[PDB]
Amino acid sequence: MEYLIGIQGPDYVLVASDRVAASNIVQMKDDHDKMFKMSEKILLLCVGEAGDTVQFAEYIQKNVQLYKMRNGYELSPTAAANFTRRNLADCLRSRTPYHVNLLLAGYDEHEGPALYYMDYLAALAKAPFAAHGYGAFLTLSILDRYYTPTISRERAVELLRKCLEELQKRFILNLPTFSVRVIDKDGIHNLENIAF
Amino acid sequence: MEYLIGIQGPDYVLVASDRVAASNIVQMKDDHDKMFKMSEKILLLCVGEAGDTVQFAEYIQKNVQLYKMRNGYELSPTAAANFTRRNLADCLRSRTPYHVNLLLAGYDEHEGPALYYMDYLAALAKAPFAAHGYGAFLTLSILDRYYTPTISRERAVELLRKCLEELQKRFILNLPTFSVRVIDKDGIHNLENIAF
Amino acid sequence: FSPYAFNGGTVLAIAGEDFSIVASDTRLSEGFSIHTRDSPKCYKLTDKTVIGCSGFHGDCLTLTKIIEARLKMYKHSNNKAMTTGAIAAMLSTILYSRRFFPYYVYNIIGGLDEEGKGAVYSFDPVGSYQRDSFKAGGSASAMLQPLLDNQVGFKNMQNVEHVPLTLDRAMRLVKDVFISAAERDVYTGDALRICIVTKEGIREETVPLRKD
Amino acid sequence: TTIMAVQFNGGVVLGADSRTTTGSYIANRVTDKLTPIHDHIFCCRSGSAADTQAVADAVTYQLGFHSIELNEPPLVHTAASLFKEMCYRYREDLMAGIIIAGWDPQEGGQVYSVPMGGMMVRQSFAIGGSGSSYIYGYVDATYREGMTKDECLQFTANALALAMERDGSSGGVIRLAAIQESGVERQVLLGDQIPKFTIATL
Amino acid sequence: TTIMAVQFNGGVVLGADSRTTTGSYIANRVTDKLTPIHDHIFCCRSGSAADTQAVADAVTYQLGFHSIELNEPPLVHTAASLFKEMCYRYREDLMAGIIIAGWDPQEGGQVYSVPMGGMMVRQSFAIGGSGSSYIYGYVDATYREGMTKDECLQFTANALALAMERDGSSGGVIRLAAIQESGVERQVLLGDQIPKFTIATL
Amino acid sequence: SIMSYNGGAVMAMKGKNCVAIAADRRFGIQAQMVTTDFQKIFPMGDRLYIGLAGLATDVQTVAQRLKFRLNLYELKEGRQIKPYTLMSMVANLLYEKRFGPYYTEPVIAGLDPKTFKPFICSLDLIGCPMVTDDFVVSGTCSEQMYGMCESLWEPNMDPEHLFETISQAMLNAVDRDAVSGMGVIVHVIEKDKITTRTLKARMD
Amino acid sequence: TTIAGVVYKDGIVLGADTRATEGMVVADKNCSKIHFISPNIYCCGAGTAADTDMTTQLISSNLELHSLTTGRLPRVVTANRMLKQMLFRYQGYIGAALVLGGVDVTGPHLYSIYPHGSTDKLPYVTMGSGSLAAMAVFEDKFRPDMEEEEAKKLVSEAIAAGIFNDLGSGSNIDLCVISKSKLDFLRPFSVPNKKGTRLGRYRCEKGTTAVLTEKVTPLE
Amino acid sequence: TTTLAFKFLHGVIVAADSRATAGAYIASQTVKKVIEINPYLLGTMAGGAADCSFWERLLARQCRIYELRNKERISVAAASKLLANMVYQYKGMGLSMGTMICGWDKRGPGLYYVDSEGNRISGTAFSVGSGSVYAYGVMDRGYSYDLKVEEAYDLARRAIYQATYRDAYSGGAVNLYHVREDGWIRVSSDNVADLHDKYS
Amino acid sequence: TTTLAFKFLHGVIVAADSRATAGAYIASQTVKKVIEINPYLLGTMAGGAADCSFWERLLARQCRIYELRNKERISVAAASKLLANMVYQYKGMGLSMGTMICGWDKRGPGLYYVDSEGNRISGTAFSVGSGSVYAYGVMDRGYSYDLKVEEAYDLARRAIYQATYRDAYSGGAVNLYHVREDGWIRVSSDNVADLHDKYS
Amino acid sequence: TQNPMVTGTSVLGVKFDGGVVIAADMLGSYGSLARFRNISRIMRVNDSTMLGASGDYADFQYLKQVLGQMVIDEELLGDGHSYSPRAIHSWLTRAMYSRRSKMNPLWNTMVIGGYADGESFLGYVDMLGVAYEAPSLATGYGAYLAQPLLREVLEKQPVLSQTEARELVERCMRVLYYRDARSYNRFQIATVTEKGVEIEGPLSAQTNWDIAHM
Numbered sequence A, B: 001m002e003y004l005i006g007i008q009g010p011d012y013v014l015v016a017s018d019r020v021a022a023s024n025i026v027q028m029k030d031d032h033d034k035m036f037k038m039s040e041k042i043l044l045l046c047v048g049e050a051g052d053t054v055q056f057a058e059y060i061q062k063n064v065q066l067y068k069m070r071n072g073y074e075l076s077p078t079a080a081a082n083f084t085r086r087n088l089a090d091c092l093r094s095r096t097p098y099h100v101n102l103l104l105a106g107y108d109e110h111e112g113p114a115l116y117y118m119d120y121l122a123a124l125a126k127a128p129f130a131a132h133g134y135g136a137f138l139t140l141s142i143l144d145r146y147y148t149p150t151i152s153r154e155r156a157v158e159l160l161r162k163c164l165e166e167l168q169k170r171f172i173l174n175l176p177t178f179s180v181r182v183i184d185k186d187g188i189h190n191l192e193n194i195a196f
Numbered sequence C: 001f002s003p004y005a006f007n008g009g010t011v012l013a014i015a016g017e018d019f020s021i022v023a024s025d026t027r028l029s030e031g032f033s034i035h036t037r038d039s040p041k042c043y044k045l046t047d048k049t050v051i052g053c054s055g056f057h058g059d060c061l062t063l064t065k066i067i068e069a070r071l072k073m074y075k076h077s078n079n080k081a082m083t084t085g086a087i088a089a090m091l092s093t094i095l096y097s098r099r100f101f102p103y104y105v106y107n108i109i110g111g112l113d114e115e116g117k118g119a120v121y122s123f124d125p126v127g128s129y130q131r132d133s134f135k136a137g138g139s140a141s142a143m144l145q146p147l148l149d150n151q152v153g154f155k156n157m158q159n160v161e162h163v164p165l166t167l168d169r170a171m172r173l174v175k176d177v178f179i180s181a182a183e184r185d186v187y188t189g190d191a192l193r194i195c196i197v198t199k200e201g202i203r204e205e206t207v208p209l210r211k212d
Numbered sequence D, E: 001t002t003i004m005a006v007q008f009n010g011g012v013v014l015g016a017d018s019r020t021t022t023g024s025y026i027a028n029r030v031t032d033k034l035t036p037i038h039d040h041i042f043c044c045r046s047g048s049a050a051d052t053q054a055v056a057d058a059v060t061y062q063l064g065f066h067s068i069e070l071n072e073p074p075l076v077h078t079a080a081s082l083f084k085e086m087c088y089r090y091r092e093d094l095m096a097g098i099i100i101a102g103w104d105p106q107e108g109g110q111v112y113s114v115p116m117g118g119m120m121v122r123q124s125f126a127i128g129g130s131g132s133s134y135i136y137g138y139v140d141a142t143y144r145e146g147m148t149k150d151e152c153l154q155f156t157a158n159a160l161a162l163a164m165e166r167d168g169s170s171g172g173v174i175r176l177a178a179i180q181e182s183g184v185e186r187q188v189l190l191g192d193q194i195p196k197f198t199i200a201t202l
Numbered sequence F: 001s002i003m004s005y006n007g008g009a010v011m012a013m014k015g016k017n018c019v020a021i022a023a024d025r026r027f028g029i030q031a032q033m034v035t036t037d038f039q040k041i042f043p044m045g046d047r048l049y050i051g052l053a054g055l056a057t058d059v060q061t062v063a064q065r066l067k068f069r070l071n072l073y074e075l076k077e078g079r080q081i082k083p084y085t086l087m088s089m090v091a092n093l094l095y096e097k098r099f100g101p102y103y104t105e106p107v108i109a110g111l112d113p114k115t116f117k118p119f120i121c122s123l124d125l126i127g128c129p130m131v132t133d134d135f136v137v138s139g140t141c142s143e144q145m146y147g148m149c150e151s152l153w154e155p156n157m158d159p160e161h162l163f164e165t166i167s168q169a170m171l172n173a174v175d176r177d178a179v180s181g182m183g184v185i186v187h188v189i190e191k192d193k194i195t196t197r198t199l200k201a202r203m204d
Numbered sequence G: 001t002t003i004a005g006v007v008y009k010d011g012i013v014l015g016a017d018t019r020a021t022e023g024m025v026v027a028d029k030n031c032s033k034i035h036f037i038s039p040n041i042y043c044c045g046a047g048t049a050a051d052t053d054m055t056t057q058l059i060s061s062n063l064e065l066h067s068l069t070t071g072r073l074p075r076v077v078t079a080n081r082m083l084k085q086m087l088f089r090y091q092g093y094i095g096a097a098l099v100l101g102g103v104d105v106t107g108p109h110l111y112s113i114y115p116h117g118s119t120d121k122l123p124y125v126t127m128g129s130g131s132l133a134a135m136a137v138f139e140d141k142f143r144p145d146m147e148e149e150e151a152k153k154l155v156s157e158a159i160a161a162g163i164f165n166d167l168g169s170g171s172n173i174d175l176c177v178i179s180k181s182k183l184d185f186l187r188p189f190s191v192p193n194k195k196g197t198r199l200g201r202y203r204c205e206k207g208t209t210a211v212l213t214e215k216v217t218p219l220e
Numbered sequence H, I: 001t002t003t004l005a006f007k008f009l010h011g012v013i014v015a016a017d018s019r020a021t022a023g024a025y026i027a028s029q030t031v032k033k034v035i036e037i038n039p040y041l042l043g044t045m046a047g048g049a050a051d052c053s054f055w056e057r058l059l060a061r062q063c064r065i066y067e068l069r070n071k072e073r074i075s076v077a078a079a080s081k082l083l084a085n086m087v088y089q090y091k092g093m094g095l096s097m098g099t100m101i102c103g104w105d106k107r108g109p110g111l112y113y114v115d116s117e118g119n120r121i122s123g124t125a126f127s128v129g130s131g132s133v134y135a136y137g138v139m140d141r142g143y144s145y146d147l148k149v150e151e152a153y154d155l156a157r158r159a160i161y162q163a164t165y166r167d168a169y170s171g172g173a174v175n176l177y178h179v180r181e182d183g184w185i186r187v188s189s190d191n192v193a194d195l196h197d198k199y200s
Numbered sequence J: 001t002q003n004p005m006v007t008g009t010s011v012l013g014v015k016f017d018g019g020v021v022i023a024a025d026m027l028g029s030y031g032s033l034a035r036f037r038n039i040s041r042i043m044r045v046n047d048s049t050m051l052g053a054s055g056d057y058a059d060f061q062y063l064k065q066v067l068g069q070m071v072i073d074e075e076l077l078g079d080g081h082s083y084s085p086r087a088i089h090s091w092l093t094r095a096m097y098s099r100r101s102k103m104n105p106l107w108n109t110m111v112i113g114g115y116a117d118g119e120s121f122l123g124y125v126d127m128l129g130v131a132y133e134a135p136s137l138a139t140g141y142g143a144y145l146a147q148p149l150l151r152e153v154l155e156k157q158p159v160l161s162q163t164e165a166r167e168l169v170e171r172c173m174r175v176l177y178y179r180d181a182r183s184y185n186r187f188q189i190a191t192v193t194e195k196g197v198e199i200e201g202p203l204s205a206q207t208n209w210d211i212a213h214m
Helices: A052-071 A077-092 A140-146 A153-170 B052-071 B077-092 B140-146 B153-170 C057-078 C084-097 C141-151 C167-184 D049-070 D076-089 D130-142 D149-166 E049-070 E076-089 E130-142 E149-166 F056-076 F083-095 F142-152 F159-174 G049-070 G076-089 G131-141 G148-165 H049-070 H076-088 H132-142 H149-166 H192-198 I049-070 I076-088 I132-142 I149-166 I192-198 J057-075 J085-101 J147-156 J162-179
Strands: A004-009 A012-018 A021-023 A026-029 A035-039 A042-048 A100-108 A112-118 A124-126 A129-132 A177-184 A187-195 B004-009 B012-018 B021-023 B026-029 B035-039 B042-048 B100-108 B112-118 B124-126 B129-132 B177-184 B187-195 C010-015 C020-025 C028-030 C033-036 C042-044 C049-055 C105-112 C118-123 C129-132 C134-138 C191-197 C202-208 D003-007 D012-016 D020-022 D025-028 D034-036 D041-044 D098-104 D108-114 D121-123 D125-128 D174-179 D184-189 E003-007 E012-016 E020-022 E025-028 E034-036 E041-044 E098-104 E108-114 E121-123 E125-128 E174-179 E184-189 F009-014 F019-024 F027-029 F032-035 F041-043 F048-054 F104-111 F118-122 F130-132 F135-139 F184-189 F193-199 G002-008 G011-017 G026-028 G034-036 G041-047 G096-104 G107-113 G119-121 G124-128 G173-179 G183-190 G211-218 H002-008 H011-016 H020-022 H025-028 H034-038 H041-044 H098-105 H108-115 H120-122 H125-129 H173-179 H184-191 I002-008 I011-016 I020-022 I025-028 I034-038 I041-044 I098-105 I108-115 I120-122 I125-129 I173-179 I184-191 J012-016 J019-025 J028-030 J033-036 J042-044 J049-056 J108-116 J119-125 J131-133 J136-138 J187-192 J197-203
Touching: A004 A042, A004 A100, A004 A112, A004 A153, A012 A042, A012 A100, A012 A112, A012 A153, A026 B153, A026 I132, A035 A052, A035 A100, A042 A052, A042 A077, A042 A177, A052 A077, A052 A100, A077 A100, A077 A112, A077 A124, A077 F056, A100 A129, A100 A177, A112 A129, A124 F032, A129 A140, A140 A153, A140 H132, A140 H149, A153 A177, A153 A187, A153 B026, A153 H132, B004 B042, B004 B100, B004 B112, B004 B153, B012 B042, B012 B100, B012 B112, B012 B153, B026 H132, B035 B052, B035 B100, B042 B052, B042 B077, B042 B177, B052 B077, B052 B100, B077 B100, B077 B112, B077 B124, B100 B129, B100 B177, B112 B129, B129 B140, B140 B153, B140 I132, B140 I149, B153 B177, B153 B187, B153 I132, C010 C049, C010 C105, C010 C118, C010 C141, C010 C167, C020 C042, C020 C049, C020 C105, C020 C118, C020 C167, C033 J131, C042 C191, C049 C057, C049 C084, C049 C134, C049 C191, C057 C084, C057 C105, C057 J085, C057 J131, C084 C105, C084 C118, C084 C129, C084 H049, C105 C134, C105 C191, C118 C134, C134 C141, C141 C167, C141 F142, C141 F159, C167 C191, C167 F142, D003 D041, D003 D098, D003 D108, D003 D130, D003 D149, D012 D034, D012 D041, D012 D098, D012 D108, D012 D149, D025 J162, D041 D049, D041 D076, D041 D174, D049 D076, D049 D098, D049 G076, D076 D098, D076 D108, D098 D125, D098 D174, D108 D125, D125 D130, D130 D149, D130 E130, D130 E149, D149 D174, D149 E130, D149 J033, E003 E041, E003 E098, E003 E108, E003 E130, E003 E149, E012 E034, E012 E041, E012 E098, E012 E108, E012 E149, E041 E049, E041 E076, E041 E174, E049 E076, E049 E098, E076 E098, E076 E108, E098 E125, E098 E174, E108 E125, E125 E130, E130 E149, E149 E174, F009 F048, F009 F104, F009 F118, F009 F142, F009 F159, F019 F041, F019 F048, F019 F104, F019 F118, F019 F159, F032 H149, F041 F056, F048 F056, F048 F083, F048 F135, F056 F083, F056 F104, F083 F104, F083 F118, F104 F135, F104 F184, F118 F135, F130 F135, F130 G026, F135 F142, F142 F159, F159 F184, F159 F193, G002 G041, G002 G096, G002 G107, G002 G131, G002 G148, G011 G034, G011 G041, G011 G096, G011 G107, G011 G148, G034 G049, G041 G049, G041 G076, G041 G124, G041 G173, G049 G076, G049 G096, G076 G096, G076 G107, G076 G119, G096 G124, G096 G173, G107 G124, G124 G131, G124 G148, G131 G148, G131 J147, G131 J162, G148 G173, G148 G183, G148 J147, H002 H098, H002 H108, H002 H132, H002 H149, H011 H041, H011 H098, H011 H108, H011 H149, H034 H049, H041 H049, H049 H076, H076 H098, H076 H108, H076 H120, H098 H125, H098 H173, H108 H125, H125 H132, H132 H149, H149 H173, H149 H184, H149 H192, H173 H192, H184 H192, I002 I098, I002 I108, I002 I132, I002 I149, I011 I041, I011 I098, I011 I108, I011 I149, I034 I049, I041 I049, I049 I076, I076 I098, I076 I108, I076 I120, I098 I125, I098 I173, I108 I125, I125 I132, I132 I149, I149 I173, I149 I184, I149 I192, I173 I192, I184 I192, J012 J108, J012 J119, J012 J147, J012 J162, J019 J042, J019 J049, J019 J108, J019 J119, J019 J162, J042 J057, J042 J187, J042 J197, J049 J057, J049 J085, J049 J187, J049 J197, J057 J085, J057 J108, J085 J108, J085 J119, J085 J131, J108 J187, J119 J136, J136 J147, J147 J162, J162 J187
Parallel strands: none
Antiparallel strands: A004 A012, A004 A129, A012 A177, A021 A026, A035 A042, A042 A100, A100 A112, A112 A124, A177 A187, B004 B012, B004 B129, B012 B177, B021 B026, B035 B042, B042 B100, B100 B112, B112 B124, B177 B187, C010 C020, C010 C134, C020 C191, C028 C033, C042 C049, C049 C105, C105 C118, C118 C129, C191 C202, D003 D012, D003 D125, D012 D174, D020 D025, D034 D041, D041 D098, D098 D108, D108 D121, D174 D184, E003 E012, E003 E125, E012 E174, E020 E025, E034 E041, E041 E098, E098 E108, E108 E121, E174 E184, F009 F019, F009 F135, F019 F184, F027 F032, F041 F048, F048 F104, F104 F118, F118 F130, F184 F193, F193 G211, G002 G011, G002 G124, G011 G173, G034 G041, G041 G096, G096 G107, G107 G119, G173 G183, H002 H011, H002 H125, H011 H173, H020 H025, H034 H041, H041 H098, H098 H108, H108 H120, H173 H184, I002 I011, I002 I125, I011 I173, I020 I025, I034 I041, I041 I098, I098 I108, I108 I120, I173 I184, J012 J019, J012 J136, J019 J187, J028 J033, J042 J049, J049 J108, J108 J119, J119 J131, J187 J197
């Protein structure tokens, strides 16, 4: 199972994900990237079925890039999150349904930071923090107990470490490295990878 | 999945096993012991079904201890390995079959060190080295390439580290600590636990 | 061949300071037909203990006879009648005896304890039980429970006097919730039998409900 | 359901039961299982009530349009050919055993049996439905060649009655029909008119 | 399989087919389905060949031992009671429809039908087996009270023949039997002796 | 069951010259809560609201498609849609997917745009409308809502009295249901104002 | 659901119960099962409620179009034909068991249409979960060419039989008398079931509910 | 259901919820998930209500008989072994019970986890139930062996409260216990609604 | 089947076995599991013989057409993407193919793993087949990025040989390839029986 | 049994002023075919009790022979103690339930009619062990077709006379013949009063087929 996690702060949104690409019982990759850049200030985290995630994530990416190309401006985090929910919901009862769970993080100049949670049945929900996978059951209560709306960027990273540390001591799966990014007014920044 | 491993040297037999006791998706224990002392120079490593292992391993232990009590001498590694194969094979077609995979390590004064491999269908096989579990597929070839019959005790431990290190980089499961013991003429010795 | 059948029915229990009420509808059904409109689901155990049984009528009859026999056997060897708490404890073990072919009955024991206070014990098919203030079982158990929590336990109410439940007031409530349960639950109807358990024996009442 | 059709010199004699059941409940006890396709062409229906009604409707629409274009009375074999085509083409869906019977100037009185699969066989007499199993030995020992129109009416009524008494899916009244060059002679045999047969007693 | 038993004044008349099939292949074409339980008590067998043979053997062992202890000719009803007991007790395993028929001094000629479930009903005549479905309407319209021993032999042969011609599991020869106070009269009706009935031709 | 996958419950009550509509705020997959402020009631006019319970994905899809049609309808013939006409529009929309329908049971509550007569109704998944003169419920705890509604509802209730009745009804109904709760929102529609309040409910 | 209909001396009398249930719980206490097809033709519906409503809405809309084109009074055979041809084409997927009855130029006609597409033309029919109870009343009291009041009495008795014996039937009894000169839609025609009067008043007093947030939005 | 138990420097802390659920309908909000085997032994319940209740009661009877025969109390290791051997005979039959046996014997504070599957492990911090995954996170993040008694109560209470907030089959009130050398004591029983206003 | 590929400092090393199996009977001991897409591109096969062979051949045709249209060779990333998009249309239909696309383009040595499931990952050391688990162990234990060309050959050879020794569906001969800047070259093809006498 | 073979249809039963009347057709069906047309489905337990059964006929014969032997054993003692109708109904319930608990039920739905100490008894016992008493019973298809008519008459006239009950039972048989496809037009009628049990028949109902023309 793959692991996704997002934390929205006052004027920034921190996201992280595992870097493991596994086949049967072996970790084929230890530095796999599960984050897809949709625009300058929009990040799409996707997990799920083998070929479904990349296939779906890249389709949404191409359309969001196309939007800016012909319009000049970029799609906002809210509009991008609704566009992807519509697409995913249109394939639900279709011939080829996408089994993907995802988090949409972005930063709008007028709306501030935004974090969206979307399950495989295409139900869009805005939240202060969210997680995906089997490791979300062991870390959602950690966030619940320590998250505060005015949490600083330095404290957000410290909070993220606690969750990731819980997975190392309680999860049966082996997830050693994590990709950590942050989106704010300046754009998307690549934070140091958290490894154990 | 649990992991067992045994390596027989010129006049000693080294064994190791994971210390994880897992329920559903969480590691309930991180220092669980899977080795059962049958006698002064006999060790029984057992893995498998929830209550089957302990239930079966303790039954065999009690009978081996009883044997010495009424006879004076202890059962030899070969005799103990045949006694446990008989018991396991008698329950196969019975009402309550034991789903346990195990390794029997011991040291006889006249026969030297001995390592036995027994699967859940009760097929006894003597070997220079053996392993059990899903992690045996990723470590049996490592042993194959580096094991030599005259391998020293210091080199045996070094070889074991390589196998355990392979699990940390390739296995999808999280097995951080391992119990390491060695049986020779002096008896059973508790080696330092190998952790990562 | 299926050994079970849903015959509907709904038992209600209410404990008071010096009383106990066990009410239920008298309709027995099968599928979409009505077997009989006169089938009480309340059984008098002792002189201060009354049991209500809903679910598979076949199991209801057998369980009821087993309990009656057990009460007589206990009196023969202990020279005294069984108390409500003892009957509840004994019933728990009787239900767990058939753990792998359980009784399809929802039991509710309502009587008085040793101090003369109203005692109500709700049960689960395999034997799990606990003492409560009030309890509802059967087809309309999820329809009445919420109302009792509100009207008897004063849940979700702010400034309220929390006045002690009296026999008079309890009688009104019982009749009212059963009237509402007959309008929505198709298994509840015909008549309502009320069994009041006080210190002066057990009293029985009967109120007519919707026939359709 | 029990349907039967017998042929004689003049034309044919059709007859059936009137019971329409759903499990053990009789939905209709006075059903008319004898449908007129044309002036002298009838058809008994057995199997599925909606399947046979849709098939009989389609054939009736086609045969009438075909009869108007040709400006001639349709042949009985053509009506059987139209039933056969539909019953074979949709043999996986439809569940109908049709007996087609009638009279035409070119071949006289003909009875065609079109069973479930969609084959088509001409017979001197035919029986279908679930109740036909009980009367195979009786129509074999009782039918003779050279029967008159009145003898066919009695023989058909006797057979249907014997099947109705043994079959749970048959019952009600007996609806007979006589087709000739003249026209159709419909008639119902109610309760006491139904031929009776004593029950072995001890 | 088609078995039949009819009773008259003197005694009874039993008859059956001789075909034993396994799917579409005839394993035995001259099978004797009429088994003697006692001197005047016979039984027709239908259903499973091994089930009915084991049941008939058991009854025969019990009835003979019972008849020796009582020092009296066994009653036909007692033989039916022994068949009924076994067929009910092991109704889940056994697959046998037995017709018991015979004669005794206390009740004369009696026919008892013991169908698959294990119930037991006395009749003036009975029919069993897979081929009996085709002859229900014929034995209903043809049987009359007051038949003689010779009339029962013809009526039974006619019915069995009609069923054999329609049933795939019936065929071969017809084995009749007449039981009376005297004894048993066994007789076979081969190929040309088998009653014939013309086929409707066009 | 597919309808109890996300949980939820909606309610509608008729007053004297007003209507009330309430719903739970919990959004969750099976036994795990994700958010506690998921919108279930959507404004379809100034005094026309619609509640949607069932599959969360279908709740948003049906709510978005209904707005699409309603918007076009109001532009075509410049007038606000009538409560009864909206129920027909929804039924039509639901019956379109007769064989493989949306998993949501809508509840409509509002007042007429020219007479302000209270109107409440509820449809099934395939679009079977059902107008009542008291209350309508929809959700996982429908049995508990009926019990509360049947014994608390009174004819001709004023806005203040109506609010209390629907509040107690939903509050006590969602407390006996595991997959429903996490807060209650109530909309009391009057002739000149719309009062919206969140209730003090349990968070377990 | 209990729907029934009979053909009296000079017309058609339809009747049905008013209870609508979703599972084993009463959803609607006053539902309408008698649907309007045309001025002289009405239809009773059983089985799936959504299917019966949409199917009768379509056939009635088609008959209205047909009636405008020809400029004549619609026939019951036309309605019977349209419904049976539609139900047969959906291979029983549109569970709509209806009791069609009306009066045209050829007199009063009663029809019973099943979900698969089969139709029957009888003097009296019953449909629904409690159809057997209504049939029992029709099998013991129906007489050919009855008076209007006698037909209304028999139909009421039939509907009542299903209401008090079938768990899926209940509430009131709606009737529909159709003749050559009139059409009386009696809703309801009988209210044999009455809800018991509340013994207490649990009126929620203002301030009993704790509020966290509140917002008021004025309108025009 | 959410039950948790951890042994620090001052004994064992045992907490649990009080919700019973029959499908999706809340059957009860006051159920007792902790069983007082004896003065120095506690047992938690999770899974099958009837199963847990019955076998824990049977275990209590065995413990009482054991003390009468040898004139001494049974150890925590011996008590849990008795329960493990008991339910092992009906292995695969469908029994559903996850229990935590806690106490204080000759080897100090003892905490064992025993289920119907066949597991019987000793440890320092366990969590059983459907809301056990959520309790683990909060527990482990604030768990220390040197934790003060008051701090240990707040930790256990908070752990259970967060599990009821996420798990739909958990809620009611948090019943807390404290196992010491002198025996167990009922610490508190706070409703989840009251804890919500205190933690916010 | 056992195929392995790793990219060190001197290009990519590609090795595989040559055994084909139809159930438990050995169909062949000389099957080619490496496909020469073009002079600078290689493709490995594992799983469905007909599947791999057909889609890799279709990929080769697309690569050839791509080079004629743009007058330049296709990259390793673009080639693997073409194969990933190809087999994604028949996802869930039963296609069984695990392939490794190796080559040398503008970004240096490229190694991609593509299967019928939908995976398309780039990496430095992969292993596909039923004997892939055994190859991983030996490969990883002796794999270094600074490995000399001769050392890289021995590693790959030994890795495959140990996999055929443990895996019943692996055997035959080890065919080795070496991808460089100038293109791939067939290094060697040693039988497993001859390697057994050299390693012992 | 697990699979019922030859079965009988519904059994009607009504209580009247001074007795109980029970009716049932004499037909044993084998699937949809009417095999045995002259079998009795009503039995006389003793002077005050009579029993009617629907369902598997072979199971009814076994119960009839077991019950019959119980009455003989009880009459052999001659101590002034005979089984009442309620005691026979109680015994049947326990027997039916015991068999259903062993997953080998007696596929029968019985109707018990009796008259003891000036009180008429009408009991019902199904195959699952579900037992109860009522003023009028109807098994199988009688519950949907005869019960509605019987209940309607007992709502206006709770107490009926012998003639009223007898003629009301004949109206139910006529309706059963019309709408039940597993029924026969030849039934039996048993009545129990203070004088004992009286089995009448084979009777037939008078049918009308005027709707065939219309």
